């Protein structure tokens, strides 16, 4: 295979990594192993550190103006780079030793064991005026030759590489999702029953979502209008719970459920960023620097944790609202998993040279 590098501005340090993204199987995490080519000839600090952080950016403006990074350090970890710590002995991976033989002794390895239950690499839809580094959630590895950790990071003597970690749809389908409601009004005895069903718990980004919806209206009034909305519950946990809401797809049906009538219809909705660029700040999946990614993937968390993770939790739902002739509005809901197909390769995003 091939391996990526990034050369530090000073040329003394260089970093070599194998794959940009890391599969988050939740139960286990891909060990993030890389190497650093070091130049002791121009090195003078006599010590080098490499550290990996996961950080979520502070939201847009700070002190009534945007810019700069008050991002909270969700998790930071450090490791010695050169000279290697003799006390630190760990089993090198095959890629590590391959890079070592390709480069030599000036390449020094490092491994990071990302704990589970950490936020997925999620980005926030920037505004058209946002010229700084993108706001959202991401990991960043970085190297720098310094004697100790305290020292101010000197941009002439360091290097950084931003990275993302991804989850994927289970190959095992869950039970076929169902929901039902029975709304009754004070004006009538017989109930208004409504039911919605989705074919599968899982969908892939860019493929349709088909819902079978049935209605039974026996009340005196009549159902007049139908709102269908593929929506997204995104939970923000910078300080505490913050369930910020924005739907992604909608359609209006002028269909009618008559009194004492049954309605059986299939509705087809398929999200796409095109009609959602205007919805500023809409959650999206991870980005390298600014390349237009896809929509945010369904965050999957281990059930053992109590869902307190200090990060954005992304879950996609579909909302069906019926309106009755002139409280009358009725809503029913069905959640659905939303992740990519089975991975096989890297993310080769496509752009002009």
């Amino acid at each position: 295979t091939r391996v990526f590098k990034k050369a530090s501005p000073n040329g003394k340090l260089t970093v070599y990594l194998g794959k940009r993204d890391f599969v988050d199987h939740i139960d286990l995490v891909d060990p993030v192993d890389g190497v650093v080519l070091v130049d002791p000839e121009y090195l003078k600090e006599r010590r080098v550190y490499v550290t990996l952080t996961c950080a979520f950016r502070y939201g847009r403006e700070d002190l009534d103006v945007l810019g700069l990074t008050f991002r909270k350090d969700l998790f930071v970890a450090n490791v010695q780079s050169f000279p290697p710590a003799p006390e630190d002995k760990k089993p090198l991976t095959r890629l590590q030793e391959r890079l070592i033989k390709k480069l030599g002794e000036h390449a020094y390895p490092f491994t990071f064991e990302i704990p589970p239950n950490l936020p997925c690499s999620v980005t926030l839809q920037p505004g058209p005026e946002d010229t700084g580094k993108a706001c959202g959630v991401d990991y960043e590895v970085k190297a720098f030759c310094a004697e100790n950790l305290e020292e101010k990071i000197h941009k002439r003597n360091s290097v950084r590489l931003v990275i993302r970690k991804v989850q994927y749809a289970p190959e095992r389908p869950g039970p076929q999702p169902t929901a039902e409601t029975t709304r009754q009004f004070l004006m009538s005895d017989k109930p208004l029953h409504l039911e919605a069903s989705l074919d599968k718990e899982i969908y892939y980004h860019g493929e349709p979502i088909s819902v079978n919806v049935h209605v039974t209206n026996n009340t005196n009034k009549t159902v007049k209008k139908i709102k269908i909305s593929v929506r997204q519950y995104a939970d923000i946990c910078l300080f505490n719970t913050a369930q910020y809401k924005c739907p992604v797809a909608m359609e209006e049906a002028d269909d009618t459920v008559a009194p004492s009538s049954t309605f059986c219809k299939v509705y087809t909705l398929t999200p796409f960023l095109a009609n959602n660029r205007e919805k500023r700040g809409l959650a999206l999946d991870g980005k390298l620097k600014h390349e237009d990614t896809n929509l945010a993937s369904s965050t999957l968390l281990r059930e053992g944790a109590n869902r307190e993770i200090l990060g954005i939790i992304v879950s996609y739902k579909v909302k069906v609202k019926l309106v009755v002739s002139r409280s009358s509005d009725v809503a029913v809901e069905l959640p659905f998993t939303l992740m990519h197909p089975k991975p096989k390769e890297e993310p080769p995003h496509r752009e002009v040279p």
Epitope: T1, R2, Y204, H205, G206, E207, P208, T270, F272, L273, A274, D292, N294, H340, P341, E345, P347, P348, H349, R350, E351, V352, P353
Partner: single-chain antibody, 227 residues
Framework: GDIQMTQSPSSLSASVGDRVTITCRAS??????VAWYQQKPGKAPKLLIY???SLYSGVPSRFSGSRSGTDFTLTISSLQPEDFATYYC?????????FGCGTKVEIKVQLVESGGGLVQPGGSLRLSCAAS????????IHWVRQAPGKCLEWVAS????????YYADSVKGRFTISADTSKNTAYLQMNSLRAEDTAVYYC?????????????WGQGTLVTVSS
């Protein structure tokens, strides 16, 4: 200048069950986003390799490929009678993407397309590709053209989910591309046609979630722009 590929082993014949070697040379650093297409003579292209290391589904394992820098090696352990056809190498990391002149070996899903035919120069003409069996939002849609004695060139691309349009340099603002999501069809209009537009046009369906080599093609339609 734009990135070029070059196909050296243009000529080869009278090979049965033997090692067949093909090289494609990349004019610039292109990493691994390279693919090889099989088109039977008078038929549609068929996907052989992508990334020069990933065999496509439904391909015999006897075909193989590899990358050596910007050079790319196609290997056949034992040639077969059905493999005497046209072979193409193409990078897919920078738009515009272009095919090299096909490598022909000589011996002694629904994608319907319509609209083409004969036309005078300096006009507009209509084509369309109705796609069935898959989902339009899950893929990008592309237009390639077959000019005999000329290297194959991609000319058009539409990204429904991203909602972007891409064209070759020689065709910028010269043709209109579109696609009805509902009808699941790609529409095409040729504004101000000239002699260079004479070719056989083929319909290619991407697979959006991550771009790779084109999987399925339409049989194409002839377009002869002449007085």
């Amino acid at each position: 200048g734009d990135i070029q590929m070059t196909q050296s082993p243009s000529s080869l014949s009278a090979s049965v069950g033997d090692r067949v070697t093909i090289t494609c040379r990349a004019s610039q650093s292109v990493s691994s986003a390279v693919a090889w297409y099989q088109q039977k003579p008078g038929k549609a292209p068929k996907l052989l390799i992508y990334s020069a290391s990933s065999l496509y589904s439904g391909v015999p394992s006897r075909f193989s490929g590899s990358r050596s820098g910007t050079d790319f090696t196609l290997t056949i352990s034992s040639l077969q009678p059905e493999d005497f056809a046209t072979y193409y190498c193409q990078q897919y990391k920078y738009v515009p993407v272009t095919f090299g002149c096909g490598t022909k070996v000589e011996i002694k899903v629904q994608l319907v397309e319509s609209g083409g035919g004969l036309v005078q120069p300096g006009g507009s003409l209509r084509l369309s590709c109705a796609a069935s069996g898959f989902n339009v939002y899950s893929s990008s849609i592309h237009w390639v053209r077959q000019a005999p004695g000329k290297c194959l060139e991609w000319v058009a691309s539409i990204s429904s989910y991203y909602g972007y349009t891409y064209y070759a340099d020689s065709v910028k603002g010269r043709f209109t591309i579109s696609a009805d999501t509902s009808k699941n069809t790609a529409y095409l209009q040729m504004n101000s046609l000239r002699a260079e537009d004479t070719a056989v046009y083929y319909c290619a369906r991407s697979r959006q979630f991550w771009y790779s080599g084109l999987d399925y093609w339409g049989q194409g339609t002839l377009v002869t722009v002449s007085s």
